[PDB]
A = this chain, B = another copy of it.
Amino acid sequence: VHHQKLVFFAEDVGSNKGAIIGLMVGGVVIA
């Protein structure tokens, strides 16, 4: 089974005060 580029920016990301997750499965993220 194949997962690829799940998240992708082709361009400048100014910031992130939160959570870029690529693939979550369990637990917690207080981003």
Contact = CB atoms under 8 A, between A and B. Distances in A.
A3 B17 CA distance: 26
Complex copy number for this chain: 6
A28 B27 CA distance: 6
A23 to B, nearest CB: 5
A20 B12 CA distance: 15
A6 B24 contact: no
Query: What class of interface size applies to chain A in its complex with B?
Result: 20 to 34
Contacts of A26: 24-27
A28 B26 CA distance: 7
B5 A2 contact: no
Interface of A: 1-31
20 contacts: A3-B23, A4-B4, A5-B6, A5-B8, A6-B7, A7-B7, A7-B8, A7-B22, A11-B11, A12-B12, A13-B13, A15-B15, A15-B16, A20-B21, A23-B25, A24-B24, A24-B26, A24-B27, A24-B29, A27-B27
